[PDB]
Amino acid sequence: LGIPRYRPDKAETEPQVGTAQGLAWTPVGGTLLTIEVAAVPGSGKLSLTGQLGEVMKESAQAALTYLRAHTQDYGLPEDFYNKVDLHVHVPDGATPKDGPSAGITMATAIASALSRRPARMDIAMTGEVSLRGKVMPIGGVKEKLLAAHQAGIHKIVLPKDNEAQLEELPKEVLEGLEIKLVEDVGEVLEYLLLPEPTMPPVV
């Protein structure tokens, strides 16, 4: 056949600070999308790069407002709204992405970047977040969970209103996975972030 012309996507292992593992629906199956966030000193801004649509940008702003409202439940700095520039980048560039099922993935990445606590990278997430912190049901559960099982991820966070859709999965992938059902984003942040900080916090 010749030179191998595709690279199979594969799970990461160690916990990263500022990074979270999301799941995406494409018309040729599901894929793993990785969301990464940096928090540098600045004046309070929000760059959103990676060819993102408008629904995804609005979901990132909703996640940031939820974290601005609860700045001492998670150990965030006291005034990051005024001293810290945030940059959300979803690689790769030159591939357009859209949709809101990425709300809790961006919430996890942003809260990991602001308070220097790593995020576990062997748990794939999906779900839509609101401004009170409610996790709302999403679409395309079957393809996303299939492609997460193909790539060696064995733990999922998923909205609680999607357990009706866990009957159309194949039995082989449903025995492989450990589904956690949530209905509130504080459970997600308590389960994903490692308890102890590593980096120096950005002033």
Ligand X SMILES: *[B]([O])([O])[C]([C]C1=[C][C]=[C][C]=[C]1)[N]C(=O)[C]([C]C1=[C][C]=[C][C]=[C]1)[N]C(=O)C1=[C]N=[C][C]=N1
Summarize as ranges the residues that interact with a second copy (CB under 8 A).
3-4, 7, 16, 18-19, 36-38, 40-42, 47, 49-51, 54-55, 58-59, 61-62, 65-66, 68-69, 81, 85, 87, 89, 91-94, 99-100, 128, 130-132, 136-137, 161, 164-165, 167-168
Q: How many angstroms separate the CA atoms of 73 and 177, rounded?
A: 30
Q: How many angstroms separate the CA atoms of 200 and 119, rounded?
A: 16
Asked if 189 and 115 count as a contact pair (C-beta separation under 8 A), the reply is: no
3-state DSSP assignment of residue 196: coil
User: What order of strands is seen across the sheet that includes strand 155-159?
Assistant: 45-49, 84-89, 29-41, 19-26, 124-125, 155-159, 178-182
Helices (H), the chain: 54-69, 103-114, 141-150, 171-176, 185-192
- Select the binding partner of residue 152 from ligand X, a second copy, none (C-beta < 5 to 8 A, by kind): none
Supply 130's token pair. Answer: 């609101």
Active-site residue, from 144, 155, 171, 180: 144
Residue 31 CB, nearest distance to ligand X (Å)? Answer: 5
Residue 129 exposure: Cα atoms within 13 Å on the Cβ side: 30
Identify residues 157-196 at the interface with ligand X (CB under 6 A). Answer: none
**Residue 97 appears among annotated catalytic residues:** no
Beta carbon nearer to a second copy, 55 or 194: 55
**Residue 57 appears among annotated catalytic residues:** no
Q: Which residues contact 18 (CB under 8 A, 6 or more apart)?
A: 36, 37, 38, 39, 109, 112, 113, 119
Beta carbon nearer to a second copy, 18 or 22: 18
Q: Does the annotation place 126 within a ligand binding site?
A: yes
Active-site residue, from 59, 101, 112, 115: 101
Q: Does the annotation place 101 within a ligand binding site?
A: yes
Q: Does the annotation place 49 within a ligand binding site?
A: no
| Choice from 84, 102, 123, 158 touching ligand X (CB under 6 A) | 102
Residue 56 CB, nearest distance to ligand X (Å)? Answer: 5
Q: Which residues bind ligand X (CB under 6 A)?
A: 22, 24-26, 31, 33, 56, 90, 95, 97-102, 138-140
Instruction: Return binding residues for Mg(2+).
Output: 23, 101, 126
